[PDB]
Ligand binder design. Structure first.
Ligand code: ADP
Lengths: 436, 193, 97, 320, 49
């Protein structure tokens, strides 16, 4: 970064006192992130306050907010991360697109840390609960590097190095050099990034080892791997690895070996929490409720309702009851996308209709997964009471009903459908379908 | 140069300069092949560009053909801009992928030239004497309509004793009719091209 | 659509002269037997017209530097319309010793 | 004139059938019409009076399409019993039963020349028949799925087809095949129809097109959408000139007006739609039946539109 | 059938090795990507061997 400043300012070089004041602050920042990047907010705040209380380095005059909230600017002074990104107004067209990322404190902070670790072509591992945002963060921090090309890889229980070998056979080529055999991507001048998505899940042996993890550790440390066809050492030229993984205390995951974990920095991405979630999806809701200008004022209560019901359901149904009871911001993103898809062709809808769409999407996201009738009844009752809590003086009977169904079969758009009419239509379509 | 290299290859002290001779011969053969393809593809593209720019209302009858040739013409424009920015013979010889790119361009332009029979028949219906001209020659005549440089080698097919025509310095007014033995007739009044 | 043959392709190449075949002395030699199946196609070329006519209506005037040659063994199947159009050089069996 | 449109309510609600009505067509010269249903019968109705005239038994399974010739003296019917029958409409008796298909024959028509019959069946083949002898002379292949309908053009030189193959395929009858393959429908293609001669000017000035300058403006197809759309095509490899979105369910039948100024359409939404295709919108909506509407036809001279439906009723609409 | 997808079932039997599943997957991928054919790939738990 100092060399970049020197190249960008040829007439004014990098002064010594500015270099000192920049490098001391960057040392404090890098110690903080390197030593508490894989811990919770409370623990990184504890490490920050310990460093502030023991070590005499100039620090920001922050009474409450932690030191990790700050950024060491290139001019040599602390700058807050929150002032970097303001409120953004995403367009109505891409309201829940797979590539849109509304900036947040944790998002920008993790993107900067990822860029720092990825510029040196160092392997890393992204850890956190499922759906926390450990692929959007990598892809957003890696879209700023045109040199990098992602290759997706999904590890399983029965993953063996032949997955990596098949990926290398597809995306790279083997060439013979006087120094030996090297392996490089076919795209000249480009770096290949292998994104292993479930890096714990390769099945641990009877003797506490994983073949894939040992293979990746050998490639990361020794710089290459033996080719089992001719027993010839094969070097890598432009290849790095990035891992994503759930925490090792999850039911299917196993702890990585210390020899592998020596090389890969680990950063812990957590669920955004309520205060971040309300903004991070109220932006989407405000963008979405521009198709219908009469529903513009029903954005903050709608976002609060989605956040509150998602929090309630996540607290109620957990991993210990059933293996599939995982609720993440993926559910909120699909919620926003479903409401947007049901609102796009209409362009005229009352608040009762909006609440009906919201409740139908809530059902289809949080009730189709469940197993027990008690859980299904709990979700129905709590959808009703959350909607009544966040939307007073509304037509409860006109916005809620026992069937509550939506379809585009009897209508060109995606509008609610009467159960009897749907049954008659399905009977006629089955009459056609028997003969076809 | 190739003849001289082959002559000194045989006799008498070629053994000491052998590797240099092979390198020279290989680069000469490579530039010969590249420019042998290049002359044909440029000769095709000049009249294809002429017919697809000077003549209008072709997109309303062959939309996919016009779009395909527009993309191929933009690609050829970019490649020739690169060649213009690198006017060295060694540089154009060692441009990465030049041989396969030019081969593919020749194949695509050949396909575009092949898929023009109905339009050529319409043009032949438009001018009666074009019925005695082949498809490729008619394509060259239509594409080089503004040039009036390659019509002298095609007028003898259309007409009886009109081997060529005489023109002014501006090459935009016909002055008379020329035969193949030098006998010429002067027009009473010229034609406003 | 017309697909050229060997003789038509060679003659069209010489007529086009993309690489300059017109300046050189070009000779077309037919090294085979002569029958009215394919030589009555060439009788217009060997005629005073110096012209080759195709079913398209495309005509290829023979350039002055090109000589149409035949290396034949006998003419027991050629007709008068073929023999009368060409100059004979009778290479007797005693020419080669 | 060239402007009459069907208006509610219907003139007569003829309800003599026993099973869903499949196809309904008019007569070329007489004031009568026929209708095909799924009970293996072809009832003949006087639409001017509104009384059932006579029936035509003979088919073993559900008859799926019917078509008159230019003279009006022949009726060609195809059924799900894999046979095609030619009816002498002067004496109302079957002339010949013409086997040859391997599955349910879906549609037939009589070419404007008058001595050839087209077909379309679930074995993905289209066959040409001889009216005089009954032999098969030409079979068309290329469709990958069930072919649903076949319609020769105005002069009999071109044949269009629609299929479960998701495509519309049009070809010349005589020697060449697959003139165009049209692939802009995202679901099954159901009902095609050509454009009449007195529609080319309105089509040219309605869609994006220059002031002709090419000659022979080219034939125009129509729709065939199980994805609730309407699509008209062009000459050569074919482009979609317009798409008339605004429909509600699976489109089952499409037509032009007699004057060529309108598009008539019926579908499973129990609705007959009148499209003002010059502005790409439906300017009139008719709640036709109490169930799915399977077919419609438009009279060339008289002001009458007739629709058949799964309601086992055939309704005739007078135009004002 | 209502949505226009083409149903594909692998039709498993005995001695159904991994090469046969690879071939079925190849045919499904070819039809779905090369020929723009919407396919509903229905697979059972008993089909996993
Ligand atoms: N700004 C945002 N912050 C947090 N989550 C988001 C945001 N935008 C979208 N999401 C959702 O969060 C989910 C994170 O999933 P992904 O990126 O695959 O990470 P993981 O691998 O942890 O699931 C995405 O599916 C996306 O729908």
């Amino acid at each position: 970064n100092v060399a970049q400043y020197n190249a960008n300012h040829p007439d004014f070089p990098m002064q010594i006192e500015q270099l000192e004041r920049y490098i001391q602050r960057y040392l404090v920042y890098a110690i903080l992130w390197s030593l508490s990047g894989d811990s919770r907010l409370k623990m990184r705040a504890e490490l920050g306050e310990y460093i502030r209380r023991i070590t005499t380095v100039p620090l920001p005059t922050a009474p409450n907010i932690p030191i990790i909230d700050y950024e060491v600017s290139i001019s040599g002074e602390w700058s807050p991360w929150q002032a970097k990104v303001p409120q953004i107004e995403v367009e109505t067209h891409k309201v829940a697109a797979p590539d849109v990322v509304v900036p947040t404190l944790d998002t920008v902070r993790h993107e900067a840390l990822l860029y720092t670790w990825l510029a040196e072509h160092k392997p890393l591992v992204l850890c956190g609960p499922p759906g926390s945002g450990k692929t959007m963060t990598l892809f957003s921090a890696l879209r700023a590097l045109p040199d990098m090309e992602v290759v997706g890889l999904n590890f399983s229980s029965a993953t063996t190095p032949e997955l990596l070998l098949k990926t290398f056979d597809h995306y790279c080529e083997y060439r013979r050099t006087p120094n030996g055999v090297v392996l490089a991507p076919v795209q000249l001048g480009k770096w290949l990034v292998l994104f292993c998505d479930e890096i714990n899940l390769p099945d641990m042996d009877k003797y506490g080892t994983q073949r894939v993890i040992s293979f990746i550790r050998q490639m990361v440390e020794h710089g290459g791997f033996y080719r089992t066809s001719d027993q010839t050492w094969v070097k890598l030229e432009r290849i790095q690895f990035v891992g994503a993984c759930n925490p090792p205390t999850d039911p299917g995951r196993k702890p990585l070996s210390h020899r592998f974990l020596r090389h890969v920095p680990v950063v812990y991405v957590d669920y955004p929490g309520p205060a971040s979630l309300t903004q991070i999806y109220g932006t989407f809701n405000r963008a979405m409720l521009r198709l219908i200008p009469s529903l513009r004022t029903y954005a903050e209560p709608l976002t609060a309702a989605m956040v509150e019901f998602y929090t309630m359901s996540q607290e109620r149904f957990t991993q210990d009851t059933q293996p599939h009871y995982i609720y993440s911001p993926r559910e909120m993103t699909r919620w926003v996308r479903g409401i947007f898809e049901a609102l796009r062709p209409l362009e005229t809808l009352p608040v009762e209709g909006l609440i009906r769409i919201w409740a139908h999407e809530a059902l289809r996201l949080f009730q189709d997964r469940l197993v027990e009738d008690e859980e299904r009844r709990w979700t129905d009752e709590n959808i009703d009471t959350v909607a009544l809590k966040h939307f007073p003086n509304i037509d409860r009977e006109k916005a809620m009903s026992r069937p509550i169904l939506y379809s585009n079969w009897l209508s060109k758009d995606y509008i609610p459908v009467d159960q009897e009419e749907l049954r008659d239509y399905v009977k006629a379509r089955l009459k056609v379908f028997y003969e076809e | 140069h190739i003849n001289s290299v082959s002559a000194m290859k045989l006799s008498p002290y070629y053994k000491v300069f052998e590797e240099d001779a092979l390198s020279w011969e290989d680069k000469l053969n490579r530039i010969m092949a590249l420019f042998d393809v290049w002359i044909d593809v440029q000769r095709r593209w000049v009249y294809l560009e002429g017919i697809f720019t000077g003549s209008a209302d072709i997109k309303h009858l062959l939309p996919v053909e016009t779009q395909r040739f527009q993309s191929i013409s933009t690609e050829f424009l970019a490649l020739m801009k690169k060649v213009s920015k690198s006017p060295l013979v060694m540089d154009v010889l060692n441009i990465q992928g030049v041989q396969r790119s030019l081969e593919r361009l020749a194949d695509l332009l050949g396909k575009i030239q092949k898929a023009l029979g109905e339009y050529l028949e319409r043009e032949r219906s438009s001018f009666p004497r074009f019925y005695f001209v082949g498809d490729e020659d008619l394509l060259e005549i239509i594409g080089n309509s503004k040039n009036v440089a390659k019509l002298q080698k095609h007028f003898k097919k259309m007409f009886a004793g009109v081997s060529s025509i005489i023109l002014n310095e501006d090459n935009s007014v016909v002055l008379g009719i020329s035969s193949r033995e030098g006998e010429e007739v002067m027009f009473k009044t010229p034609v406003s091209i | 659509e017309w697909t050229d043959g060997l003789f038509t392709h060679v003659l069209r190449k010489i007529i086009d002269s993309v690489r300059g075949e017109l300046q050189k002395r070009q000779w077309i030699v037919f090294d085979g037997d002569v029958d009215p199946e394919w030589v009555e196609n060439l009788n217009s070329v060997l005629d005073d017209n110096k012209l080759l006519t195709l079913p398209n209506g495309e005509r290829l005037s023979l350039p002055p530097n090109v000589r149409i040659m035949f290396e034949v063994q006998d003419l027991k199947y050629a007709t008068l319309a073929t023999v009368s159009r060409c100059g004979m050089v009778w290479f007797s069996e005693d020419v080669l010793s | 004139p060239k402007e009459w449109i069907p208006r509610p309510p219907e003139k007569y609600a003829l309800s003599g059938h026993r099973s869903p009505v499949t196809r309904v067509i008019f007569h070329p010269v007489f004031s009568v019409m026929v209708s095909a249903s799924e009970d293996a019968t072809i009832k003949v109705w006087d639409y001017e009076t509104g009384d059932f005239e006579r029936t035509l038994k003979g088919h073993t399974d559900s008859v799926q399409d019917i078509s008159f010739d230019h003279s009006g003296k022949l009726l060609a019917s195809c059924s799900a019993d894999m046979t095609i029958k030619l009816w002498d409409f002067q004496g109302f008796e079957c002339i010949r039963t013409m086997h040859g298909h391997d599955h349910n024959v879906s549609s037939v028509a009589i070419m404007p020349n008058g001595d050839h019959i087209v077909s379309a069946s679930r074995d993905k083949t289209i066959k040409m028949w001889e009216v005089q002898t009954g032999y098969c002379v030409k079979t068309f292949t290329g469709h990958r799925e069930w072919v649903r309908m076949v319609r020769p053009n105005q002069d009999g030189t071109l044949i269009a087809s629609c299929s479960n193959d998701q495509t519309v395929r049009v070809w010349v009858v005589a020697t060449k095949e697959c003139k165009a393959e049209l692939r802009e429908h995202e679901h099954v293609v159901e009902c095609i129809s050509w454009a009449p001669e007195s529609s080319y000017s309105s089509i040219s000035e309605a869609t994006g097109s220059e002031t002709k300058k090419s000659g022979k403006p080219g034939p125009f197809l129509l729709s065939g959408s199980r994805d609730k759309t309407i699509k008209m095509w062009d000459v050569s490899t074919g482009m979609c000139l317009m798409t008339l979105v605004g429909h509600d369910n699976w489109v089952r039948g499409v037509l032009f007006h007699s004057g060529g100024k309108f598009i008539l359409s019926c579908a499973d939404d129990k609705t007959l739609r009148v499209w003002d295709y010059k502005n790409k919108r439906c300017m009139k909506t008719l709640n036709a039946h109490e169930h799915f509407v399977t077919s419609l036809d438009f009279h060339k001279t008289a002001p009458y539109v007739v629709t058949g439906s799964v309601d086992q009723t055939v309704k005739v609409w007078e135009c004002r | 059938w209502m949505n226009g997808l083409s149903v594909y079932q692998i039709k498993v039997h005995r001695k159904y090795t991994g090469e046969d599943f690879d071939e079925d997957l190849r045919t499904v991928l070819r039809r779905s990507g090369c020929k723009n054919e919407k396919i509903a790939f229905i697979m059972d738990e008993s089909n996993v061997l």
